[PDB]
Amino acid sequence: AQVAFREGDQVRVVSGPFADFTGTVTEINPERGKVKVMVTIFGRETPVELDFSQVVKA
């Protein structure tokens, strides 16, 4: 039993100043290929939109 991705999971950022945080998958877009996760920067929530090409599974 294996899986590529699952809603409600946690994924880290790709790079940049945010290359040390994760997010909470709220919704997915298979038809296109996007992903939304709620990250936390400076000790505060921050909902941002990304894509598998800018995130990683942890």
From Swiss-Prot:
Coiled-coil ranges per UniProt: none
Signal sequence annotation: none
Gene Ontology CC annotations of this record: cytosol
Keyword list, A-Z: Transcription, Transcription antitermination, Transcription regulation, Transcription termination
Disulfide bridge positions per record: none
Keyword Membrane: no
UniProt-listed GO biological process terms: DNA-templated transcription termination; regulation of DNA-templated transcription elongation; transcription antitermination; transcription elongation-coupled chromatin remodeling
Family: Belongs to the NusG family.
Known function: Participates in transcription elongation, termination and antitermination.
Name this polypeptide is given: Transcription termination/antitermination protein NusG
